[PDB]
Amino acid sequence: SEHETRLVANLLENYNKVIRPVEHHTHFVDITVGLQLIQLINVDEVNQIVETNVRLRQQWIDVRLRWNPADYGGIKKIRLPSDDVWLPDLVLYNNADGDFAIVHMTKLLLDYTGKIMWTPPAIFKSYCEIIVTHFPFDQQNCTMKLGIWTYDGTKVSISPESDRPDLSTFMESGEWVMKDYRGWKHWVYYTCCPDTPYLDITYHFIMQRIPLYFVVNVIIPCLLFSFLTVLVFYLPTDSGEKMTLSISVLLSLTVFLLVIVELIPSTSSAVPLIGKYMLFTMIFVISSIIVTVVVINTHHRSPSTHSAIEGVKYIAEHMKSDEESSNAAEEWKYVAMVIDHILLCVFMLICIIGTVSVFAGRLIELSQEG
């Protein structure tokens, strides 16, 4: 009725969708961004890729959408679908690995005045720093910049909307844990050109990694091996009868250490941990190495151990006596006096190396835990 058909048709005719609500040569189209990650689905620190939930709150005004009693008078605020709207080519700077998912053909709301919001339920593919400094106990801050993609601060400008945590909807299924995250605004003008360039939202993800299951399995076969090597020390000094017997273990255990290496480097390759983490294992594991080789070479270190009728009796007794000598010689080879030395020599070494391994372990755990 009330100019019913005349209302609706007029609107279609003189209105070009593609036109950008440019208002004189100035303020650019003022458009603000506001991301609220509802939640995260999955991440790969190794490949620094994340699939996340984002509701993008996009705001801007088109004074061409203002109305009178025949549009606003009809029903204050209403639902108009996107299409007709000029969609900022939003883009995560050093990220952007994937298209915005569910950004397309959604709707928006127009007020009696004009103000419009476009907030389609997104979830997409991301790309943020993790560097080999993300899995640390001391984390790294995922630097993520967002802003207008192909338009300049003269044609348009993307601005921020508010502060909010990243652990606000951080995934509890993540193999990592959050410290804090902040985001502040910025305008990037380049010494290149004397012009005034796009605006941007810079995310900073500060989170520290490593789920604790890993922790237990690995350090215990170490104190495990510690005891066998501990036995590697005590077994010899309290019984050199199974030196070779332990030859076996030395084989079974470094190979155990070798195969643990396949498993945890793929972990290494599975998750990017700051290499300086690797040196822990480096000297630790390798002392199992230098100690053995010496301990067991030393274990090994030892030469071979690892009237007339009366005279008959004395030529015979003399035979038993110098072989008597001989027996004592090889025993004069494998002494039990210094195998005790190596026992405390290295156990203090191990309690040193060990407590030294615990050192930096404990130390930056004095930093991380904080």
Partner 1 sequence: VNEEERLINDLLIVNKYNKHVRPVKHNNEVVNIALSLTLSNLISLKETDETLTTNVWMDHAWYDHRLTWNASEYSDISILRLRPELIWIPDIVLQNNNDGQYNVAYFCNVLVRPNGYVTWLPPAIFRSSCPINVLYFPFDWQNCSLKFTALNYNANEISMDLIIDPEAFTENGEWEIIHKPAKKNIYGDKFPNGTNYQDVTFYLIIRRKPLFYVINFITPCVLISFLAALAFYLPAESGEKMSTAICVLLAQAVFLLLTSQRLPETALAVPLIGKYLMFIMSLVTGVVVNCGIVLNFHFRTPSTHSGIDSTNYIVKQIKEKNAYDEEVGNWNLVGQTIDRLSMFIITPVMVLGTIFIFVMGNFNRPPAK
Partner 2 sequence: SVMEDTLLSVLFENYNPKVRPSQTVGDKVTVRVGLTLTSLLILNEKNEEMTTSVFLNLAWTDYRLQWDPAAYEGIKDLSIPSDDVWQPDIVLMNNNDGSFEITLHVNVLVQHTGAVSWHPSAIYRSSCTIKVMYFPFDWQNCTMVFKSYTYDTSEVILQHALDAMINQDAFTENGQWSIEHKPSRKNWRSDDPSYEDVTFYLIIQRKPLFYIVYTIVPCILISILAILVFYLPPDAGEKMSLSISALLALTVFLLLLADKVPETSLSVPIIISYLMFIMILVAFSVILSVVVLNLHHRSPNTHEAVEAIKYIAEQLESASEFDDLKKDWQYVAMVADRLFLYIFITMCSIGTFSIFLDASHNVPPDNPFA
Partner 3 sequence: NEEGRLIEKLLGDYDKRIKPAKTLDHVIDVTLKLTLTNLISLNEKEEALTTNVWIEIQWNDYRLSWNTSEYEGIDLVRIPSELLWLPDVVLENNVDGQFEVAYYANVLVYNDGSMYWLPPAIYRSTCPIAVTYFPFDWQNCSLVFRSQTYNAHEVNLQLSAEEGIDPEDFTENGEWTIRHRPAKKNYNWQLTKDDIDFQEIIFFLIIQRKPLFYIINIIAPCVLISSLVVLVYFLPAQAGGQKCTLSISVLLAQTIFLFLIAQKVPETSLNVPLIGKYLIFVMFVSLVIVTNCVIVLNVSLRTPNTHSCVEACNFIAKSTKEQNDSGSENENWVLIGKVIDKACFWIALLLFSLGTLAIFLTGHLNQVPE
Nearer to partner 3, 131 or 177 (CB): 131
Q: Which does 193 bind (CB under 5 to 8 A by kind): partner 3, partner 1, partner 2, none?
A: none
From candidates 81, 121, 165, 303, binder to partner 1 by CB under 8 A: 303
Q: Binding mask 340-369 vs partner 3 (x if CB under 8 A, - otherwise)?
A: ------------------------------
Q: Which does 331 bind (CB under 5 to 8 A by kind): partner 2, partner 1, partner 3, none?
A: none
Q: How far is the CB of 45 from partner 1 (least distance, A)?
A: 14
Residues 112/113/115/117 CA torsion (nearest 10 deg) = 10
From candidates 101, 102, 247, 349, binder to partner 1 by CB under 8 A: 247
Applying the rule CB under 8 A, the residues between 131 and 160 that interact with partner 1 are 150, 154
25 belongs to the binding site for partner 3 (CB under 8 A): yes
Q: Binding mask 57-76 vs partner 3 (x if CB under 8 A, - otherwise)?
A: ------------------x-
Applying the rule CB under 8 A, the residues between 248 and 307 that interact with partner 2 are 248-249, 251-252, 255-256, 259, 263, 307
Q: How far is the CB of 217 from partner 1 (least distance, A)?
A: 20
193 belongs to the binding site for partner 1 (CB under 8 A): no
Tell me which stretch binds partner 3 (CB under 8 A): 59-67, 165-173, 196-204, 356-364.
Answer: 165-173
Longest dimension (CA), the chain: 153
Return d(Cα 114, Cα 324) in angstroms, integer: 113
Point out which residues bind partner 2 (CB under 8 A): 41-42, 75, 102, 105-107, 120-121, 173, 217, 221, 224, 227-228, 231, 234-235, 238-239, 241-242, 244-246, 248-249, 251-252, 255-256, 259, 263, 307, 309-310, 312-313, 316-317, 320
